Amino acid sequence: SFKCVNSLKEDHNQPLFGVQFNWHSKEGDPLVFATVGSNRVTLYECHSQGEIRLLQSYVDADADENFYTCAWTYDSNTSHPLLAVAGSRGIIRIINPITMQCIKHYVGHGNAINELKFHPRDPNLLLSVSKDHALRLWNIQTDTLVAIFGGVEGHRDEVLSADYDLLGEKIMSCGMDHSLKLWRINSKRMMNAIKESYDYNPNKTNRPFISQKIHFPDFSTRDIHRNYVDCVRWLGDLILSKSCENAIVCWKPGKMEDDIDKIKPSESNVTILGRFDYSQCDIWYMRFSMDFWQKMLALGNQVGKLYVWDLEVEDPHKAKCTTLTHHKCGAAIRQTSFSRDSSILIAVCDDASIWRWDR
């Protein structure tokens, strides 16, 4: 079981909106996690006796930038880890975590970026979701915009979260329009577009790279939540999503026996497989996380309480809940992250505090 072994606070006293362990850290190296808040990203190393060792930050030249999200990948040629960060300026920065140099950056979104996710099988495919109502898929090997997911049948308000399924064949997105939308990226069109993005070298051609405009989701529902949907994750063929209504809903498109890959864009039904209720999480932009194996789920609420659900049970509604509290942890927890071996859980807070829980 988890025990609180340490805490600290960052000097900017602004909300920490994101935290991510590097699950690509090398064998024998210490566990490392990144935090994002204010205009900075900071790396820490976990050591014995609860020590949280401060390494080095990247601080944006723009004092008005506010980083919201980060995501780890690695360089596909060298294996060295890379860190992507983004927030209110709508600029994606690719950071070398060793030196905290910004290697390159991407602009395109019309507004703030609310989440970044890397493809589960391709370290170069980066998904961003934005306040401008669109998702964008980037190839950070050839520095190309592969596709924009939008249109009037796309989201009609800010996109707040998205997630790739296990094989990276499809994306589920969600946001302020209360909707969850499915976008298949294993279509012939999208597989071809990804292949072409790898063949693009601007020094060897005259053409710009053409991005796909994907204006129709492969499924859409507004029947799960009744407010902003701010976090979504695949659990196999099922979906876990939450709003600001003190519940994570486990659901699937279609009827109970409907295969996810036979769902048509006109599908009108959903099936609710369970709901995990909790308390005092009425504000939006509050993210849950899962461990590497998807055996557990952790969510913090707006008064500093952690909920952890054990999903190693026969059916989703049988999940087993544990709660973790500390008398000094009273600020809203924006995001959690498990280490890859699941031995450490980190929570970060609106008062710039960081909380370490060891199993």
């Binding site: 902003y228 009425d282 504000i283 939006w284 008064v303 600020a331 809203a332 609106d350």
Partner: peptide, 5 residues
């Protein structure tokens, strides 16, 4: 509806 507590 608020982003902050």
């Amino acid at each position: 509806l608020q982003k902050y507590a």
